[PDB]
Design a protein around this ligand. Structure first.
Ligand code: CLA
Ligand code: CLA
Ligand code: CLA
Ligand code: CLA
Ligand code: CLA
Ligand SMILES: CCCCCCCCCCCCCCCCCC(=O)OC[C@H](CO[C@@H]1O[C@H](CO)[C@H](O)[C@H](O)[C@H]1O)OC(=O)CCCCCCCCCCCCCCCCC
Ligand SMILES: CCCCCCCCCCCCCCCC(=O)OC[C@H](CO[C@@H]1O[C@H](CS(=O)(=O)O)[C@@H](O)[C@H](O)[C@H]1O)OC(=O)CCCCCCCCCCCCCCC
Ligand SMILES: CCCCCCCCCCCCCCCC(=O)OC[C@H](COP(=O)(O)OC[C@@H](O)CO)OC(=O)CCCCCCCCCCCCCCC
Ligand code: HEM
Ligand SMILES: CC1=C(/C=C/C(C)=C/C=C/C(C)=C/C=C/C=C(C)/C=C/C=C(C)/C=C/C2=C(C)CCCC2(C)C)C(C)(C)CCC1
Ligand SMILES: CCCCCCCS[C@@H]1O[C@H](CO)[C@@H](O)[C@H](O)[C@H]1O
Ligand SMILES: CCCCCCCS[C@@H]1O[C@H](CO)[C@@H](O)[C@H](O)[C@H]1O
Ligand SMILES: CCCCCCCS[C@@H]1O[C@H](CO)[C@@H](O)[C@H](O)[C@H]1O
Ligand SMILES: [Ca+2]
Ligand SMILES: [Ca+2]
Ligand SMILES: [Mg+2]
Lengths: 97, 32, 39, 137, 79, 37, 501, 28, 38
């Protein structure tokens, strides 16, 4: 069974929410207060077993945890996909405008 | 009133040309 | 008089020529102002 | 279609107040935006970071909000990252950094208001083209 | 078997005639446009007549035989 | 801008650079006057 | 001696050897026809007129035999799909044979005319010089052409003494050869009306008999004889080439746009039928009427003939080929085996989605599905990173009604995508790509090849016309101009070229 | 206007020299 | 009926005949006045 793993990943929560373990960093621009400061810590500290583990990143401020809580509903986690995280692609996935 | 072929020929071109150039001159002052 | 030569051909040429330059110049001006100027 | 006072009416602040820009004010803002900003922000995008554009919806979600005259003017005096967390004067044109960005040196309040007004009106005219990049050319 | 142009265009008669007719045609063309008659003769949009206020789609003719009517409708839709 | 004393002369300063071109054009007025002999 | 491009000029004043050259030409053309038909019979598979008709098999002459009533083989089959028909002598094979025999007889006649070129008939009774009286030959030939045209219309096409012509319904589902009555009203000028072709031949044929009698009986005006150089055979060549390029352009046009004489069961559908979704509209009409009479979706789609569905498929559009993509349409997409049925796509919400069809202009085309209002609902993305419409996000599924897959539903995104890629081509077919080692790349039908060859030849024949018209009208100066500088200078003559002014 | 006037004055000058010399049979 | 487009056709035909008719009447008139000497 040859499968395109990126297209298959679009049928998971990855296709519906910001996947903390896979989605490229620009995606965090979609909601108030996430980019660039929280975006960087989230990407640097991935992967997470559950979205709520994002609250445990070392060094987060009290306000950062609050902003993260307000955005847990926009987040998801799926298994790390090599094709999405190699190449430094979470920091620049070759898409601009 | 005596015309020539050449005279007719020159004026079928020259007369609209000047009219058109006045038209185009005016257009340079149109603002959106 | 229908007399040819009365106005030297060089003056006719110089004046018609400046006429052309002026009209064409106006058209270039128009490329930067009003319709077509992108502004 | 024409550039009506309705089109020229934009949010002055986050609380519901609007101003109606004059035709003259809009054209001045356009000219000033070209002069001071379009080198990086032509058509609403940002050439040195294309992830952030000047679309109204994007500005609405910046911190502090930047989708109104006063927020845009504040951005022009004291620019921040999108999360409001770092001050970026030192790498972004502003009144505060008009020493190292000289095209900012003579801008008055009126100038900033006009620029801000251009930025909010342009999408109301151009729709998706504003901030859309080459896809929409 | 006719007069050389350079005899004609260097003659006083020519310039007397044409100093009236050339500026007159030029001015008539100028006014064909400045009075806006050129728009109405050719059906060309003025700068405020490409779109009704909100719409962003072009009034493209889609029907061969009621093309006349369609354009009329598009023109009425300009409030 | 020019020093402000000279400001009145701005419109003249704007046309000056084109003058060298008028010299090339002048050669032709002249030659037409000696009938391109 | 003569340069290579003038060798045939030796015939200009040798009417017997010209006839011999003409006889040879006609032997060659008729032998081509006989050979072509035999090669087509050696390659044509008659076993499926529904999904494997002649126009999918690169058949070029078979349709011309079929258009005028030759529909059977001695071996028992017919192009309409019958068995045990007995076509008499005039099967495709007997036509091919008749042309081969004709060729041979023509060849032998050419030899005779070549050897016995010096007939007294070809000499002018006064001067004894070779001479053809062309104005009278024109009348004789025009009269004969008149009698034949009339005969063709009045006996053959009517069925009064002959088989008639191919006619069909507007969707090319039930074609057959039928007697056709002349249409004498203005609908006789409708290209799509077969009765007009019949009235044309009756009426134009009588006009040719009358005008030929005129031309037999009345000499040309001296003014026209002189102006058109009627003593010079090359005048006839010039104007005959003009008539022929006019005719060639007309047949290229009626082949491309379609007419009663370019039926779609013989030449394939037209590109315009795809452009206007001509068949898709008729299919949807039949389906809706089924639904309105209380059919289930399965029954309504199952009632659509495979033949109608197959017209609604872009691989049968003549505007999807390539100049160097050679051979039968079967060589590209394959030999069509069966309709898969009509695919209905739906998103996870159950809304029906419609795949945007490929216009003929495009070699490739994106896969985009919209709702009934043209709003985009799903697609196959190129960049994935900011995809919003993938079949996977939108839970697109496909269900088939009618054909092989009737009643089946697929939900796995690879398979749903594969069918959506096929849906850009219209209705979906199963093809045998192995038998001919088909390469998957579209080819045009004989409608397209006929059109191409005849538009190109008509254009080139325009040159031939100009060339020979020039040679006729400038015969006196064709070796160069007279060895006064007052005919070609100004002021010397009042009227150009006129020495008596 | 100021610009167009300088232009017309400066531009006229060349042709003026030619015209003057022509008028007084000068060494053209 | 005489359809709108058949009336359109007659208009086109008459127009063309008038253009040609006038052109020829005028050229014949001129040629008749302005004769060649021999
Ligand atoms: C130019 C006009 C024209 C054309 C192209 C056709 C074409 C055709 N006719 Mg129509 N027809 C016409 C005018 C025409 N007809 C006229 C004017 C009449 C009234 C007389 C008819 C009345 C008519 C009848 C009654 C029949 C046809 C049939 C046919 C088809 C078979 C004949 C054939 O291919 O011979 C091609 C001929 C040659 C290539 C010439 C060969 C000549 C030499 C000597 C070789 C002979 C070969 C062969 C051994 C002889 C056959 C024997 C046979 C009589 C049994 C063919 C589609 C037949 C049909 O229906 O078939 C399905 C048929 O029965 N036609
Ligand atoms: C009631 C009597 C009757 C009836 C019903 C018909 C019926 C018909 N005739 Mg016939 N006709 C008749 C009597 C009749 N005729 C008589 C008495 C004569 C005189 C002998 C003719 C001579 C005649 C000619 C010469 C033609 C017909 C054609 C036709 C058909 C017209 C439909 C069509 O497909 O045109 C399609 C053809 C056209 C619309 C003509 C196009 C004209 C072109 C544009 C002129 C310029 C061409 C030039 C080379 C430049 C092209 C440039 C290009 C490359 C861009 C139809 C079968 C036409 C035909 O054969 O069609 C297949 C045709 O060309 N007839
Ligand atoms: C009007 C002429 C005509 C037309 C429209 C067709 C049409 C058809 N034929 Mg038939 N055929 C013809 C005449 C024609 N044929 C002749 C004369 C022969 C004898 C050679 C054949 C023998 C034949 C065979 C053996 C086969 C066909 C087949 C076919 C089909 C595929 C055609 C194809 O792939 O072409 C491809 C066409 C090209 C690649 C275009 C060639 C362009 C030339 C090379 C350009 C030359 C340029 C020139 C040298 C430049 C000079 C420049 C100079 C002046 C300076 C199609 C239905 C095929 C089929 O499916 O049959 C069932 C098939 O197998 N044909
Ligand atoms: C009915 C059509 C027809 C006929 C009967 C003729 C006949 C003639 N032509 Mg004209 N001509 C025609 C159409 C025709 N032409 C067309 C369509 C064109 C444009 C292509 C021309 C352009 C033309 C020119 C420019 C010249 C002639 C000349 C001649 C004369 C000498 C021909 C010769 O010796 O060639 C000998 C030819 C060869 C030895 C080889 C030619 C090989 C060709 C290029 C490729 C192979 C063709 C292939 C075999 C044929 C299939 C044809 C089919 C697909 C149409 C002769 C009177 C010549 C002339 O006027 O002499 C005073 C001359 O200079 N013709
Ligand atoms: C570039 C085009 C062109 C040129 C330069 C020539 C040149 C020549 N032609 Mg050819 N001819 C042409 C195209 C051309 N022809 C076309 C398209 C046809 C129809 C098939 C012919 C049919 C033809 C014949 C039958 C004869 C000539 C002959 C000649 C020669 C003498 C002049 C003559 O009769 O003119 C003909 C005049 C014209 C081409 C002008 C036609 C103007 C028409 C009537 C205007 C129609 C307007 C239209 C109604 C508007 C409606 C448009 C519609 C789409 C809405 C000369 C070599 C003669 C010759 O070879 O003598 C030795 C000869 O016998 N011509
Ligand atoms: C003459 C004497 C000797 C022959 C000349 C030498 C051959 C010269 C070149 C012939 C080129 C043929 C194409 C090459 C490719 C090929 O194999 O075709 C091969 C094709 C056959 O195609 C084959 O079909 C097979 C099944 O039957 C399979 O599908 C094969 O895959 C497929 O290739 O042959 C033809 O189609 C012949 C006829 C084509 C005629 C089309 C009309 C277009 C003519 C307009 C041109 C005039 C413009 C020029 C004016 C200037
Ligand atoms: C709006 C509808 C359009 C169509 C209807 C109008 C038809 C006009 C077409 C005729 C073209 C006119 C050409 C001029 C004729 C002419 O001047 O002849 C020349 C003659 C005589 O001049 C003696 O001198 C001879 C010199 S020359 O022959 O004129 O060159 O005219 C006399 O004045
Ligand atoms: C299906 C059956 C097929 C069989 C047919 C096969 C026969 C085909 C014969 C065709 C060959 C004809 C060629 C003759 C060639 C030939 O004889 O040329 C020279 C010839 C000179 O003719 P003259 O009038 O000087 O007569 C001298 C005599 O000796 C000629 O017989 O001129 C022409 O033939 C005119 C047209 C050819 C001009 C073509 C020149 C091409 C230049 C080079 C182009 C390539 C380089 C391009 C680089 C970018
Ligand atoms: C006075 C002229 C300018 C104006 C009015 C302006 C306006 C803005 C605004 C409103 C934003 C925030 C966008 C958002 O939050 O959605 C922004 C961001 C940005 N602009 Fe400008 N800008 C100007 C000049 C420039 C120039 C000349 C450059 C290039 C050197 C530039 C590069 C950037 C970059 C890189 C960002 C993103 C900064 C970050 O968040 O890290 N800007 N600008
Ligand atoms: C003698 C005789 C005989 C026999 C006969 C025969 C057997 C014949 C055959 C014939 C034939 C069998 C023929 C054929 C022909 C062919 C042809 C003539 C072809 C041509 C071709 C062409 C021309 C082409 C061209 C082209 C090409 C190549 C490529 C593409 C393009 C084109 C299309 C251009 C008999 C016994 C009856 C009896 C009597 C005597
Ligand atoms: C040289 C080939 C001669 C062979 C002729 C066999 C004739 S067979 C004959 O043909 C007639 C005409 O089609 C038919 O009407 C008839 O039913 C059929 O049996
Ligand atoms: C040159 C001699 C070869 C001629 C062969 C003549 C076939 S004759 C042909 O035969 C068919 C059965 O095969 C019948 O259907 C048909 O009626 C009959 O005309
Ligand atoms: C491959 C598993 C999914 C099946 C969906 C395939 C679309 S349909 C498929 O298309 C081929 C052309 O690509 C034809 O040759 C073949 O006959 C047909 O079965
Ligand atoms: Ca305005
Ligand atoms: Ca294979
Ligand atoms: Mg302008």
């Amino acid at each position: 069974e040859l499968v395109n793993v990126v297209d298959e990943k679009l049928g998971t929560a990855y296709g519906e929410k910001i996947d903390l373990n896979n989605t490229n960093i620009a995606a965090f621009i979609q909601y108030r207060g996430l980019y660039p400061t929280l975006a960087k810590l989230i990407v640097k500290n991935a992967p997470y077993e559950s979205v709520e583990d994002v609250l445990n990143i070392p060094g987060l401020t009290e306000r950062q945890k609050q902003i993260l809580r307000e955005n847990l509903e926009h987040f998801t986690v799926t298994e790390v996909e090599t094709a999405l995280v190699e190449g430094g692609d979470r920091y620049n996935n070759g898409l601009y405008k | 009133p005596i015309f020539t072929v050449r005279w007719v020929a020159v004026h079928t071109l020259a007369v609209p040309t000047i009219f058109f150039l006045g038209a185009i001159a005016a257009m340079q002052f149109i603002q959106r | 008089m229908s007399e040819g030569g009365r106005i030297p051909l060089w003056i006719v040429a110089t004046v018609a020529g400046m006429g052309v330059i002026v009209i064409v110049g106006l058209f270039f001006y128009g490329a930067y102002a009003g319709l077509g100027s992108s502004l | 279609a024409e550039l009506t006072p309705e089109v020229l009416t934009v949010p002055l602040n986050s609380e519901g107040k609007t101003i109606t820009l004059t035709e003259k004010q809009y054209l001045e803002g356009k000219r000033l935006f070209q002069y001071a900003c379009a080198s990086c922000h032509v058509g609403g995008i940002t050439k040195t970071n294309p992830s952030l554009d000047l679309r109204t919806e994007t500005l609405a979600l910046a911190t502090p909000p930047r989708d109104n005259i006063e927020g845009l003017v504040d951005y022009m005096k004291n620019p921040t990252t999108y999360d409001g967390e770092q001050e970026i004067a030192e790498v972004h044109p502003s009144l505060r950094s008009a020493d190292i960005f000289p095209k900012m040196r003579n801008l008055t309040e009126k100038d900033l208001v006009a620029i801000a007004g251009h930025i909010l009106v342009e999408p109301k005219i151009l729709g998706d083209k504003w901030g859309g990049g080459k896809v929409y050319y | 078997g006719e007069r050389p142009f350079s005899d004609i265009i260097t003659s006083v008669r020519y310039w007397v005639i044409h100093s009236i007719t050339i500026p007159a045609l030029f001015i008539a063309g100028w006014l064909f446009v400045s009075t806006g008659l050129a728009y109405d003769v050719f059906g060309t949009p003025r700068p405020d007549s490409y779109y009704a206020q909100e719409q962003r789609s072009i009034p493209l003719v889609t029907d061969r035989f009621e093309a006349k009517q369609q354009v009329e409708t598009f023109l009425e839709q300009l409030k | 801008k020019l020093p402000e004393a000279y400001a009145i002369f701005d419109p003249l300063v704007d046309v000056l650079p084109v003058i060298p071109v008028l010299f090339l054009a002048l050669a032709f007025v002249w030659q037409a006057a000696v009938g391109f002999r | 001696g003569l340069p290579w491009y003038r060798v045939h000029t030796v015939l200009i004043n040798d009417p017997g050897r010209l006839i011999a050259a003409h006889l040879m030409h006609t032997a060659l053309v008729a032998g081509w026809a006989g050979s072509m038909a035999l090669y087509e019979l050696a390659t044509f598979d008659p076993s499926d007129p529904v999904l494997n008709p002649m126009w999918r098999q690169g058949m070029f002459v078979l349709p011309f035999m079929a258009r005028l009533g030759v529909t059977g083989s001695w071996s028992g089959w017919s192009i309409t799909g019958e068995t045990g028909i007995d076509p008499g002598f005039w099967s495709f094979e007997g036509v091919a044979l008749a042309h081969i025999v004709l060729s041979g007889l023509l060849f032998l006649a050419a030899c005779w005319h070549w050897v016995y070129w010096d007939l007294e008939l070809f000499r002018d009774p006064r001067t004894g010089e070779p001479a053809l009286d062309l104005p009278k030959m024109f009348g004789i030939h025009l009269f004969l052409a008149g009698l034949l045209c009339f005969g063709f219309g009045a006996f053959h096409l009517t069925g009064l003494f002959g088989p008639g012509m191919w006619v069909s319904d507007p969707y090319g589902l039930t074609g057959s050869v039928q007697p056709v009555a002349p249409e004498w009203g203005p609908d006789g000028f409708n290209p799509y009306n077969p009765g007009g072709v019949v009235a044309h031949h009756i009426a134009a044929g009588i006009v040719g008999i009358i005008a030929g009698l005129f031309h037999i009986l009345v000499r040309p005006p001296q003014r026209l004889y002189k102006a058109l150089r009627m003593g010079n055979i090359e005048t006839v060549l010039s104007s005959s080439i003009a008539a022929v390029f006019f005719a060639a352009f007309v047949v290229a046009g009626t082949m491309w746009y379609g007419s009663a004489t370019t039926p779609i069961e013989l030449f394939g559908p037209t590109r315009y039928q795809w452009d206007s979704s001509y068949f898709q509209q008729e299919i949807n009409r039949r389906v809706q009427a089924s639904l309105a009479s209380g059919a289930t979706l399965e029954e309504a789609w199952s009632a659509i003939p495979e033949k109608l569905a197959f017209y609604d498929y872009i691989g049968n559009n003549p505007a999807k080929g390539g100049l160097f993509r050679t051979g039968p349409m079967n060589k590209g997409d394959g030999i069509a085996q069966a309709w898969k049925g009509h695919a209905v796509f739906r998103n996870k919400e159950g809304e029906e989605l419609f795949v945007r069809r490929m216009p003929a202009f495009f070699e490739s085309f994106p896969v985009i599905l919209t709702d009934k209002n043209g709003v985009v609902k799903a697609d196959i993305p190129f960049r994935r990173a900011e995809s919003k419409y993938s079949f996977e996000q939108q839970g697109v599924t496909v269900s088939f009604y009618g054909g092989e897959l009737n009643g089946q539903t697929f939900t796995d995104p690879p398979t749903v995508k594969s069918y959506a890629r096929k849906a850009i081509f219209g209705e979906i077919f199963e093809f045998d790509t192995e038998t001919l080692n088909s390469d998957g790349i579209f080819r045009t039908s004989p409608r397209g090849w006929f059109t191409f060859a005849h538009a190109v030849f008509a254009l080139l024949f325009f040159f031939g016309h100009i060339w020979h018209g020039a040679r006729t009208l400038f015969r006196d100066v064709f070796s160069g101009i007279d060895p006064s500088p007052e005919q070609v200078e100004w002021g010397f003559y009042q009227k150009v070229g006129d020495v008596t002014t | 206007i100021a610009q167009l006037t300088m232009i017309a004055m400066i531009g006229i000058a060349g042709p003026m020299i030619i015209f003057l010399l022509a008028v007084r049979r000068g060494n053209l | 009926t005489i359809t709108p487009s058949l009336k359109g056709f007659f208009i086109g035909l008459l127009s063309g005949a008038v253009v040609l008719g006038l052109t020829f009447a005028v050229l014949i008139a001129i040629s008749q006045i302005d004769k060649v000497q021999r």
